[PDB]
């Protein structure tokens, strides 16, 4: 959120990241993916990226906590990390 007046060259600030370990619990191997995500990333995009990694449809998948708590995807990844930590499940 620092305003750069004249950035003609297109320099970008790389944002702080949060990491999630996401397990596909419908597969008996319990495969997991660890995603490193810029903090402001909408959680909808994390769901999409995870679903693509597991080759399941994003439209019919949801991410929940390891305690079974639903996660409103209309939130930033940073806020999801602060509230729920890193250990998440992807499910139908």
Residue numbers in the entry: -13 to 78
What does the paper say about this structure?
The modification of proteins by ubiquitin-fold modifier 1 (UFM1) is implicated in many human diseases. Prior to conjugation, UFM1 undergoes activation by its cognate activating enzyme, UBA5. UBA5 is a non-canonical E1 activating enzyme that possesses an adenylation domain but lacks a distinct cysteine domain. Binding of UBA5 to UFM1 is mediated via an amino acid sequence, known as the UFM1-interacting sequence (UIS), located outside the adenylation domain that is required for UFM1 activation.
